[PDB]
């Protein structure tokens, strides 16, 4: 009888010195995270649901500079995230498989689930036809 919410988590993925990923590659890595969190959610009473989708945003590469480190920002959104279930800290999944994004340059707290209060509540289970 519970209702769920949309929630997001953002994190940073850094690429090797002197390299430059395609946008497709960056999003692909970011979807490894997505897949990671789905497995963790799944083996934790579906705290976050199974419906997750990722977008990513990178800094331009510096074709001139040979040291440049490309910082990608990876944003995962859980569409059926459980507010009533206690929040799960980054400390509990920073090492889970696929979970390769880290704390963001410039920020002083770690990546964290942020519930979107503006968005409407939805059911926690997805009905394909109902």
- Whose structure tokens read 């002197």? 18
8 A C-beta contact, residue 9 and residue 130 = no
Domain residue ranges in the chain: 1-130
The closest of 8, 83, 6 to 47, measured between CA atoms, is: 83
- The token pair at 87 is 């929040």
Distance (Å, rounded) from C-alpha 14 to C-alpha 73?
9
- The token pair at 116 is 């979107």
Distance (Å, rounded) from C-alpha 24 to C-alpha 58?
11
Distance (Å, rounded) from C-alpha 93 to C-alpha 84?
19
8 A C-beta contact, residue 26 and residue 58 = yes
β-pair partners for 77: 8, 53
Q: Write phi, then psi, for 46 (nearest 5 degrees).
A: 55, 40
DSSP 3-state helix, strand, coil percentages of the chain (rounded to 5)? 20, 25, 55
The closest of 4, 58, 67 to 28, measured between CA atoms, is: 58
Note the Cα 46 to chain centre separation in Å: 15
Distance (Å, rounded) from C-alpha 42 to C-alpha 122?
19
Three-state DSSP at 27 gives helix
- The token pair at 62 is 């510096």
- Given in angstroms, what resolution was this structure solved at? 2.3
State the DSSP string of 49-98.
-S-EEEEEEEPPP-SS-SS---EEEEEEEEEEE-SSSPP--GGGTTTSTT
8 A C-beta contact, residue 52 and residue 79 = yes
The closest of 93, 66, 55, 70 to 13, measured between CA atoms, is: 70
């Amino acid at each position: 009888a519970y209702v769920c919410r949309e929630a997001s988590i953002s994190g940073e993925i850094r690429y090797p010195q002197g390299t430059c990923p395609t946008k497709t590659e960056a999003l692909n890595d970011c979807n490894k995270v997505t897949k990671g969190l789905i497995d963790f959610s799944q083996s934790h009473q579906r705290a976050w649901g199974i419906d997750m989708t990722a977008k990513v945003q990178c800094a331009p590469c510096k074709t001139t500079d040979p040291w440049d480190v490309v910082l990608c920002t990876c944003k995962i959104t859980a569409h059926r995230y459980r507010e009533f279930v206690p929040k799960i800290p980054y400390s509990s999944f920073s090492s889970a498989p696929g979970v390769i994004f880290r704390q963001e340059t410039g920020l002083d707290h770690d990546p964290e689930w942020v519930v979107n209060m503006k968005a409407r509540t939805r059911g926690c289970d997805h009905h394909h036809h109902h």
